[PDB]
Structure formats: C-alpha cells, structure tokens
Design a binder for this molecule. Structure first.
Ligand SMILES: C[n+]1cn([C@@H]2O[C@H](COP(=O)(O)OP(=O)(O)OP(=O)(O)O)[C@@H](O)[C@H]2O)c2nc(N)[nH]c(=O)c21
Lengths: 78, 191
C-alpha cells in the first residue's frame, strides 16, 4: 500500500495557527473574519463558515490512509 | 512560504486545524445471518484538519446510499455516540425528521450539518454544549440531530443551537426542530 502525494503532503504539513486572511490564491475566499473577530481564544477556537469549507470538496479527494478501503470493509465486513 | 492545498493539491505545506479532534462513527444494519444485532456501532476514523475531513467525506458512502437502520455519527474525540457515555448521559438532542424524497438533498443537508459542527458555527466559544451530530436512516424518514452535553446548563445557549441547526438545514418557519433529553428522567423547547 502506497500513500498519495496529497496524503503525503497532509501528513507532513504544519497546522495553520488559527484563522488566517491572507494566504489564499486568486478565487479562493478566506474564512469569514467577522466570525472570528469576537472569538477570545484565537489559538484554540477556529470558526470556519460553511462556504469556506465547501471550497475543499473537489480539491482534497484522496483517501485519508493508504488502506482506507480495506480498513472500512473489514470494519463493517459482516 | 505557505502553500495550501489550493496552491498545489499534491505539494502543500499547511493545513487547517479544527478546534478539537472529531471521530466519525457508523452504525451498520443487523446482519441478514441473525447473529449480530448487539454490536453494530463502529468507530471509523479520528481527524483534526479540514483537509482530512474532506478526504474522509470523499471516500465514504453518502447518506443516500446507506441501508435502512444505518447511521453516521460525528462526535468530538473521546465521546462515544451513545446515551451511556458520561458526556451524553445528562444531555439530549435537537432533531428534525425529513421525508425520504429526492428534492430533499439529504446528502447536502448532512454534509452542511457536519461542516457547521467542525467549523464551530453551531455554538459559541464557551457554550460547551455540542457533543456531536448524527444522521439516522430509517424506513419512513431521515433524522438529523445535534447531541448536547446538558439539558439545563443554560437554556438560552441550547435554544440558539436549535435555531442554528434550523438555519443550517434551510428549513422554513412551519418546520420545527425539537429538543429532547436522552433519558426519560432528563426529559421529565422547539424552534
Ligand atoms: C443512539 N442509539 C440507538 N440505539 C438503538 O437503535 C435504535 C434506533 O434508535 P433511534 O433513536 O434512531 O430510534 P428510532 O427513531 O428509529 O425509533 P425506535 O427504535 O422505534 O425507538 C433504538 O431503537 C435502539 O434499539 C441505541 N442503543 C443504545 N444502547 N445506546 C444508544 O445511544 C442508542
């Protein structure tokens, strides 16, 4: 079993420190800053609007583990 | 510096944290053999990023493909999606039942429910009430719920959660979302 390039990248990437406004390429919206404006613990609580989250749907499509399909089948094997 | 998944979906170096770790659970239907009706709840995967969520979601059956008597549950890490868990024992749920009709895009509704949960737009930062969300596939209907830790820590905090779920589900005003305690005791609030 061999991990995908995206999975390898995910495994090795670093967490963003919270909501960030200025790191996205053209055509990609940031998370709504107003929802985090009122947040007090910004290093622990990260508000993401649904529209922002939906941007990932057709972007990260890879399995979250190399044998995910095999793990699922055996878990609900019946 | 930071390449997101949107800069290069095969070579990126930052990911989007969730405010806690979440675990996806699945309830299978009883086996047609008849020797497993008491061990149906399965722990699928625990995750901690927005990207990981979508890797899971894109590789699992949509609700509309599940058999009757199946459920998905998305709960904060450490909380089992059962009434006996210490964090649900004195709690309850806000729930709504949908008809199984095609103009009801149940997959989208469930998806948006999970996104509201993990994106922390169901409750405010100190509320401490949301434990998870659940979709139930039944014969007559689908049910979508938000499970809560208490039934009484703060009524206003609970009502606001119910109103947000109603908004997430895009329900019109006649359609009511209802709160109920898991136990008869913790039951003995509609929006
Ligand atoms: C969430 N949950 C569900 N079940 C089982 O799953 C079934 C469906 O649970 P359900 O709450 O979705 O009920 P449904 O609306 O389909 O109605 P009912 O079955 O007629 O009351 C229940 O009947 C129980 O048999 C559960 N059984 C236990 N032990 N603990 C739980 O938390 C639990």
């Amino acid at each position: 079993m061999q991990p995908s390039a995206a999975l390898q990248s995910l495994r090795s990437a670093r967490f963003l420190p919270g909501i960030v406004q200025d790191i996205y390429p053209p055509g990609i919206k940031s998370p709504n800053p107003a929802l985090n404006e009122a947040v007090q613990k910004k290093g622990r609580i990260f508000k993401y609007d649904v529209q922002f989250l939906l941007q990932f749907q057709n972007v990260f499509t890879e399995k979250p583990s190399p044998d995910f399909d095999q793990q699922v089948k055996a878990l609900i094997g019946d | 510096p930071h390449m997101t998944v949107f800069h290069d979906k095969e070579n990126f170096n930052v990911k989007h944290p969730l405010s806690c770790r979440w675990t996806l659970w699945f309830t299978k239907p009883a086996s047609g053999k008849g020797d497993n009706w008491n061990d149906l709840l399965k722990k699928v995967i625990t995750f901690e990023s927005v990207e990981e969520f979508w890797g899971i979601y894109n590789n699992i059956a949509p609700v509309s493909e599940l058999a009757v008597k199946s459920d998905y549950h998305l709960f904060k890490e450490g909380v089992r999606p059962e009434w006996e868990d210490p964090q649900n024992k004195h709690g309850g749920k806000w729930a709504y039942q949908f008809k199984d009709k095609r103009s009801v895009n149940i997959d989208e509704l469930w998806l948006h429910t999970m996104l509201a949960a993990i994106g922390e737009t169901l409750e405010d930062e100190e509320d401490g009430e949301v434990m998870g969300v659940v979709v139930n596939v039944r014969k007559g209907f689908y049910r979508i719920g938000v499970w809560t830790r208490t039934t009484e820590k703060s009524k206003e905090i609970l009502m606001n959660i119910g109103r947000r779920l109603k908004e997430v589900l895009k329900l019109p005003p006649n359609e009511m979302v209802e709160f109920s305690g898991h136990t008869e005791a913790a039951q003995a609030m509609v929006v």
